[PDB]
Amino acid sequence: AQNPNCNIMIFHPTKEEFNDFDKYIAYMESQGAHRAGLAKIIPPKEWKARETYDNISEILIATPLQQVASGRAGVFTQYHKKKKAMTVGEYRHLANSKKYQTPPHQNFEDLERKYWKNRIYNSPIYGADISGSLFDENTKQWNLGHLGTIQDLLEKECGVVIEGVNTPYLYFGMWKTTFAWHTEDMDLYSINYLHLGEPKTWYVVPPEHGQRLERLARELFPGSSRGCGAFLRHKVALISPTVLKENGIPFNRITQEAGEFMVTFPYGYHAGFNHGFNCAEAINFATPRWIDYGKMASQCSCGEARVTFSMDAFVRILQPERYDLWKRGQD
Ligand SMILES: O=C(O)CNC(=O)C(=O)O
Numbered sequence: 028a029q030n031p032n033c034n035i036m037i038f039h040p041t042k043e044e045f046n047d048f049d050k051y052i053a054y055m056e057s058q059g060a061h062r063a064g065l066a067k068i069i070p071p072k073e074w075k076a077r078e079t080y081d082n083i084s085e086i087l088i089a090t091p092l093q094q095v096a097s098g099r100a101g102v103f104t105q106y107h108k109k110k111k112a113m114t115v116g117e118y119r120h121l122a123n124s125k126k127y128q129t130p131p132h133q134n135f136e137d138l139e140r141k142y143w144k145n146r147i148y149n150s151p152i153y154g155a156d157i158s159g160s161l162f163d164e165n166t167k168q169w170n171l172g173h174l175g176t177i178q179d180l181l182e183k184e185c186g187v188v189i190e191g192v193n194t195p196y197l198y199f200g201m202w203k204t205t206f207a208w209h210t211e212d213m214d215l216y217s218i219n220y221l222h223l224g225e226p227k228t229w230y231v232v233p234p235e236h237g238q239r240l241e242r243l244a245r246e247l248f249p250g251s252s253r254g255c256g257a258f259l260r261h262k263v264a265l266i267s268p269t270v271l272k273e274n275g276i277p278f279n280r281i282t283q284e285a286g287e288f289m290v291t292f293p294y295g296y297h298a299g300f301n302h303g304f305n306c307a308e309a310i311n312f313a314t315p316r317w318i319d320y321g322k323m324a325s326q327c328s329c330g331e332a333r334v335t336f337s338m339d340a341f342v343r344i345l346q347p348e349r350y351d352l353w354k355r356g357q358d
């Protein structure tokens with residue numbers, strides 16, 4: 028068995044190996060990358076996502092979200108408070124202000140300590156889930172707006188044509204902006220490219236151990252757990268690495284820098300934070316190996332999780348017994 032300790036693997040494809048996306052994901056899996064739940068891909072030195080980032084200030088963040096925490100430093104939830112619209116230029120200025128800027132620090136490890144110690148006492152503002160792309164249309168390799176669609180994958184594997192579309196999303200982050208513990212919708216893969224700015228630290232639980240994290244979460248968030256059998260789908264709960272270690276939950280951590288891709292694998296729980304002003308792009312995707320995960324994915328039917336139009340067909344076709352109850356939660 029490849030990668031039996033479920034360590035996060037880092038890949039350095041050549042320009043020739045960067046041509047065929049599907050083939051390279053399958054190569055990474057042949058080496059056991061999926062066992063970690065997360066992999067890093069450093070693009071060949073010849074590659075670029077676009078020529079420059081000098082002209083992105085007029086992008087609009089229609090609904091910036093202030094991330095307000097409740098709980099204790101290591102075990103907290105966050106809610107999102109909607110703020111007034113601002114441009115990327117305005118947001119970048121805010122991120123760099125004395126109220127929100129990254130503090131002085133020695134290294135990534137010192138910054139991680141400061142995050143976990145102090146996150147709950149501040150409410151950073153995140154520009155999330157903005158439909159769009161920063162890849163140049165002429166970038167032919169690993170362009171997140173030109174991937175094969177999950178609808179076409181389900182049709183190729185299962186023979187059924189379905190409605191829906193699959194497009195990327197932009198994330199503009201600042202110091203302490205936070206992504207809560209989750210897997211993807213329908214336990215899909217995700218791919219994330221850090222276009223510019225400061226790093227993003229990730230934590231991940233190997234897929235084979237995801238139920239251990241779920242059990243701890245039910246213990247640590249007991250009201251939430253009573254309200255919904257799949258409440259991590261709400262994307263609001265944070266658990267620190269110190270707490271995970273104290274409770275014997277297997278996990279790994281890695282920092283992604285600008286110009287690097289991360290891939291999350293089916294049923295790989297992940298969480299993390301941004302180091303300072305940055306812009307990432309991400310999208311879900313599928314492979315043939317995903318289908319069995321899609322069939323078994325938990326669902327939130329309490330009404331909180333509320334998801335895209337395109338998840339309907341995945342539930343309908345892969346989870347027909349669940350469909351009626353899940354759709355009630357959507358309505
Ligand atoms: O970058 C973020 O805020 C969160 N991204 C992801 O969870 C992802 O790419 O799967």
Ligand SMILES: [Mg+2]
Pocket residue numbers: 082083084085086
């Ligand atoms: Mg612009």
Ligand code: NI
Pocket residue numbers: 209210211217291297
């Ligand atoms: Ni994710």
Ligand SMILES: [Zn+2]
Pocket residue numbers: 254255256257258260261327328329330331332
């Ligand atoms: Zn729910």
